[PDB]
Write a protein that binds this ligand. Sequence first.
Ligand code: PRO
Length: 172
Amino acid sequence: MSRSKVFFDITIGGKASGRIVMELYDDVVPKTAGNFRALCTGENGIGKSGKPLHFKGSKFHRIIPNFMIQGGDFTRGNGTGGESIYGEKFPDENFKEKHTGPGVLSMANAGPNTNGSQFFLCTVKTEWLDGKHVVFGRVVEGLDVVKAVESNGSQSGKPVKDCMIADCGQLK
Ligand code: PRO
C-alpha cells in the first residue's frame, strides 16, 4: 500500500501562486490520511452540511506568521466549520508522527477527538503540538507556495487577502 499524493493549486488575491504537493502517511494513519485524500478529490459528494466535501474553492482562513497556515473550513470559511467524510468529528487516530519542521501537515481540532476537515501546514517546527494534533503528511513540493501564503497572515491570524485552494486532487 503506497502513500497518497495530493495537491492544491493556490491563488492569492486571485493570482495563480503555484502548486503545493503533499504526501500522506496512509501507512501510519490510514483513517486520517483517507479523510484528507477524499476531501482533495471531492469523491464523497455533498456532506451533512449540504456543502461539498471538497477543499476546492475553500480558503486558508487562519494564517499566523512564523507558525502555520490553516484551512479546510469549507462550510463556514471561518474556523467554526468543516466536516469529515465520516461525519462531523472523528477520534485522534494516533500521535506517532511529530511536528518536526516546516511542511508538516496536521489536523486542526477543538480538543481531543474532534477531527473534522480543518488542517494546518506548519512553517516551523511546532513541537508543543505533539500529542495534541494528529500529524498525517508532509509537503514534498511547493514549500515556497506555503511561504507566499504565510506572508499574507497576521499575528492575529486574519489573512490580508484571500488565499484560496483554486484546485485540488490526487496525483498518480
Ligand atoms: O489554530 C491554532 O492556533 C492551533 C495550532 C494549530 C492548530 N490549532
